[PDB]
């Protein structure tokens, strides 16, 4: 597509983390999440019955996709990527296949992904999706259960507390019944999807990885795919910073994702916001190396960009504009 | 007797709880900061009652647990707990017969917070006090404040001057008769023995109205000790305000004194306010007040899920450990 | 002078707090100063022999008046006011009358006020002076000793610890021997002085107040004088914020002084920096009411503008420029 | 015996001290932040030795008091104290015969910090350990690091590649023979019994040179327990690095283990780093390490006046109170 040229020149995007984890805001029964507040269910092994109950309290009165996209646009971000479903397995769109979602399970009773997809269409911002194709703590057969020999931002990679029978788990059950169906949903509704963001597989076959690639290719012909999916199945390489000089990308497309503070999900204890000058300088450094900066905002329980995140994005923009006048 | 006088003389330490619709905004409104006082946020931004009240539809504090809150208070050596029955925004945190603008009728939560705390205290053996905003009520067309705006606040005007912008056609008596006295009767009649009563310094309240509340409390709660703030003849202990603390003055004839503070700089929960007093500051202040025969009433602003903030709990518990250490050495 | 017109249009100035208190940086023997780190000697009643000993450690290797004035200039500040001598009584210039000064008492062995006066001359910034004409904790007969019935940011207003004989103290001794002589020094050397900043007298006669007024008028004909001096003896009223609407100034000249964090002097525990947006908005509000914003920087022990102060001034400038383009 | 082995098994808790020229910059250089590691600041900004060394002329820590530091350590139940004799910047914090780039010869202070701490520990009955950077030395033309820059650091290059930019003409042997071995002999001979010895993992040091230091320490300080970091045959306790802590691995044949941490995120003092671990975090970590037979070596980065930062002292003391409370309950 002309989508390859467009990504080469896009430079700057907004990432959005939002889900049930946002209501706990980095805190559980007087104890801190790790740096990663969105991992809180794994960190404290919160039973699905309890964690899911957060859905009943999810009523973000101040959520406004128009205002979020406007902010992104004012900062010169040319695209927006959003959590359709994180490791906890809660869909932030109206999933036909699973009622564990913002639309069916919450007083809010609205499709977040829908409102953001629309807001982007009208503002002329491309629209990307993140989806956790491997881990699903809500699914009896969610991924992670053949790869716990490594430490996480929680405890185990899988829901080992609600489903403590690793040897009687089968990821295929989860892949066939939830993963592929939900990927079809998000890739079919919500119009043109410019970017697709999957996790590095731990517990899914080359087949399953190839399957998602094909499903995305068929459904969203122009959709650029994050390297994390698999060694043959991508269009741009997501760089982790220590991979940047002073994973072959044949299209020459590169993205580095970061957050303004230290968490992806909202965390009221994390006030360690990168200063405007840090945000601007990092953006400048990545852009000069032909790397897109995908900068994460973790929306708060009322659906708001935290005050200091908004302030710092806007001040970073002012510094950039000032510097482009010289 | 009122052996309640002797008990207050020796109580030394209490928990205060601020909680209401303001807690959901958590010191933030449309990208902008509340003042140090997050509970004033409606006045600060002149949030129309229609919008602010809509917060009630989002109030579902899944983790609220009066037992756990009272247990914490008890573990820190606090002998009583005082709670916001209704703050300046005029939203009742109990099941008010007289006004449906309350936690029970207006919220998914559909529960009486004052009730659960009153019970939790009974069972734990902690006295139970009440705070009520008898003068300001931003929800009431004729709420107080509208004859006293010549002075600055933690918001804008003292009264709801935005929804009700006709200062010259306002009458507080309407509000006093229809909401204030009735609600004070409610909280002073239900929820059992009330050990402490906390009113604001009147701005827009006659001597009559002040005397009326005094009498109502005296009749309903014979042993209830009353905060000086109410009125110059109408109290049992003087609440001291920081600059009134030892190294005009209102006579305390019973010798009873209380200073209220917060752990951070806000009474209501505020995400942006992480300026928690260290355990050593909490302990030292408590010790200083207690040595001058002053009770320390220390405020916790519960978060939107009904939780004591992690750093508030940590700091209370560490302050307790320092105190115990010091009482062994 | 054309100095009246110039102040009406100046809008923005840098204030500098710096002295021995800066080395303690808000901390003494494991205990915190108040919000006002420069009050630390009074707060802990540090004996003059000990506090003065800080002079032996005062070697600010990174002090650079050119760089400080450049920053001020880049932020659009049109003048710079500096502590010649704060309540602790230590002169930050080469005082003939008292060797308790940066030049004579410190390894640094340099005139701070001199270097700043020069840097301002060359950059085309006006140059103002602050001087504590009443309190002097180093002087046996320093002020404050007839007015302790009120609380301070320390303990007593006077040095009541080294000199504990209030009834045998005589401020005239201090006024004649240190105050008037030092005011003559700072008002005679260091060239044109655009602004003069005295404290509200507690313990000095109408005579003594009139005397300083006259001395300034004679020495610095065009020097605009801060209302704090006395009810007949000023050119602009210094406003304290809660005095601003929604002290008659007949020239129509107004100044409000603030700090970026909560302290005037450097305080390593005070990281409560006003955000760029707060600084810019406050400046805008004061300027719209015809009030000059005098914004304080408390230099650190090495003579540096703290990193977050510099960042926040520069970002506030970028926001202002952005807003002036619209 | 070496009853020093039994003593380390039961010691549980030690104070580490970082202090040097880097402490005066306090995590800041020309308007810019050090990394999390303020002590790396010279490498981070490639500060020429002429300039960085000039900091020595400003080093006059009027409030340094080894007695008070050791007293604090003792009150927190720390049984030993380890100190930076010389960090990567190559500045000795003792009176080195072999190199005048030291606190005694180069600074107004004109005093041996290692000496005063060694004495203070003797009198208080605390063991005394030493840290020394045997490989990196940014002051030495032939300092280590110059054959291992393919990996990222808390600064820029591992070696001083800015003052000495001729990697291909550098020879570490020059540095080892003339500065490293001589200085290790100095610190291991003066300052009395040395209980603990802390070297960096070699990058640019032969087996010979590693064995040499081992032997030198063994000869000079028979009872000195040596940190695993030195070399795979040349140690007595394994220093565990966080991700090595229980819920390849190097065998500890004596069963001796140490984990070093800091209270905030820096080893050296940093004005901008106020991210102090809470007392409850300190206590819990100590408890967890101790239960797995691991000693907690907890670092304090002294400020330019030689002071334990106020929040470091507060947090150590509050952590102690929590520990004592928990050991009564």
Numbering used by the authors:
A (entry chain C), C (entry chain C): 2 to 247, 266 to 345
B (entry chain A), D (entry chain A): 1 to 247, 264 to 345
Sentences reproduced from the published study:
To gain insight into the structure-function relationship of AlfC, we solved the 2.5 Å resolution X-ray crystal structure of full-length wild-type AlfC. However, unlike this enzyme and most other α-fucosidases, AlfC is missing the C-terminal domain often hypothesized to be a carbohydrate-binding module. AlfC crystallized as a tetramer, with opposing active sites separated by ~37 Å. To confirm this, we performed sedimentation equilibrium analysis, which also indicates that AlfC exists as a tetramer in solution. In AlfC, the nucleophile (D200) is conserved in both sequence and structure. However, no general acid/base residue is present within the expected ~5.5 Å distance. Structure and sequence homology implicate three main candidates for the general acid/base residue: E39, E274, and D242. The D242 Oγ atom is ~19 Å away but located on a loop with very high B-factors that extends into a disordered region in our crystal structures, which together suggest a high degree of flexibility. It is common for α-fucosidases to be crystallized in either an open conformation, as seen in these structures of AlfC, where the presumed general acid/base is far from the active site, or in a closed conformation, where it moves into the active site to support catalysis.
Lactobacillus casei produces a GH29A α-fucosidase, AlfC, that is ~104-fold more active on α(1-6)-fucosyl linkages compared to other linkages. This enzyme is particularly relevant because α(1-6) linkages form the basis of human core fucosylation, which significantly impacts the function of glycoproteins such as antibodies. AlfC is a single-domain enzyme that adopts a (β/α)8 fold typical of GH29 enzymes, with an active site at the center of the barrel. Our results suggest that AlfC employs a conserved hydrolytic mechanism with a specific subsite that accommodates GlcNAc in α(1,6)-linkages, while AlfC tranfucosidase mutants work by shifting equilibrium between open and closed conformations of an active-site loop.
